[PDB]
Structure formats: C-alpha cells, structure tokens
Design a protein around this ligand. Structure first.
Ligand SMILES: CC(=O)N[C@@H]1[C@@H](O)[C@H](O[C@@H]2O[C@H](CO)[C@@H](O[C@@H]3O[C@H](CO)[C@@H](O)[C@H](O)[C@H]3NC(C)=O)[C@H](O)[C@H]2NC(C)=O)[C@@H](CO)O[C@H]1O
Length: 130
C-alpha cells in the first residue's frame, strides 16, 4: 500500500521512530519518501550483485533480509524479505532499527543521502501533528 504523508508520520512515531538512535521522524519521513514514495510494495532489483531492495524503506536482501535469490546473503534481520512487502510495516520498522545500528547508520540509505542528508527536512512532517 502507499501511505499518505501524515498517515505514515503518525505510524512511524507510534512505532518509536521519532528520535531513534538520534534520528528524527522528519529524516525517516524524507528517507521513506525518496526510497519508495511511501510504497510498501516497492522493490528494486540490482542486476549488479543480484540483490533486491524491499519495501517502504528499501531494505537490501544481501545484508538484511532473505529472499532466497541473493548470493552472499547475510540476513542480519533474521527475516524473510516478504515481511517487508506487507501493508503493516511493523516488521519493516524492526529491521530498519537493526540496519541503522550498524557503523554507517542512516547512510545505509542512498536515497536519503542524495535527497535528505544535510538538507532541511522539516516539510515532511509539517502539519501532521507529530
Ligand atoms: C537499507 C539497506 O539495505 N541498505 C543497503 C546498505 O546497507 C548496503 O551497504 C552495506 O552494509 C553492510 C552491512 O552494514 C556493510 O558491511 C558492514 O560494514 C561494517 C563497517 O564497515 C563491518 O564491520 C560489518 O562487518 C559489515 N557487514 C558485513 C556483514 O560484512 C557494507 O560495507 C555496506 N556496503 C557499502 C558499499 O557501504 C548497500 C551495499 O550493499 O546496499 C544498500 O541497499
């Protein structure tokens, strides 16, 4: 499903996203916007290493989830990539929390790096009452 901006903001806040590991909700909002357009069914196949990015947060199948088709997969989230394609994003949020705990943190998300890092992201949560 495709979340409406404020609907997503409220869901993430409710799931403990606001300030997680020091990262703001607006930053998470910007990340989701540019990674998937708030679409939980979004998938991106990377011909290079044969890995795929899954869900609203576009989490990669080589290091975080298992899709059974990616070489050298690590499955750090100990979760099937299918759970990252659900309308209910609780599983995705739990894996995202694991992803960010690694050394490079939020820099793990290229779209966030390109369109959010070092920029003003206050607009993504404006008028959402979060
Ligand atoms: C959200 C998402 O799935 N993003 C993907 C990126 O996370 C991914 O980058 C790679 O992540 C792994 C795991 O964090 C990096 O290896 C970790 O790096 C630390 C410190 O360097 C090391 O101590 C860990 O052992 C190591 N993990 C393992 C299991 O080896 C890896 O270096 C990251 N790659 C790069 C190029 O920075 C990228 C690329 O795979 O894809 C995103 O979709």
């Amino acid at each position: 499903k495709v979340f409406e901006r404020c609907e997503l903001a409220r869901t993430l806040k409710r799931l403990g996203m606001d300030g997680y590991r020091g990262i703001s909700l607006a930053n998470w909002m910007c990340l989701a916007k540019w990674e998937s357009g708030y679409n939980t069914r979004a998938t991106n196949y990377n011909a290079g290493d044969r890995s795929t990015d899954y869900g609203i947060f576009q989490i990669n199948s080589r290091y975080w989830c298992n899709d059974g088709k990616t070489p050298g997969a690590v499955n750090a989230c100990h979760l099937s990539c299918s759970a990252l394609l659900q309308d209910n994003i609780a599983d995705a949020v739990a894996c995202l929390k694991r992803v960010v705990r690694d050394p490079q943190g939020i820099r793990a998300w290229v779209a966030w790096r390109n369109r959010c890092q070092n920029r003003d992201v206050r607009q993504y949560v404006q008028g959402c009452g979060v």
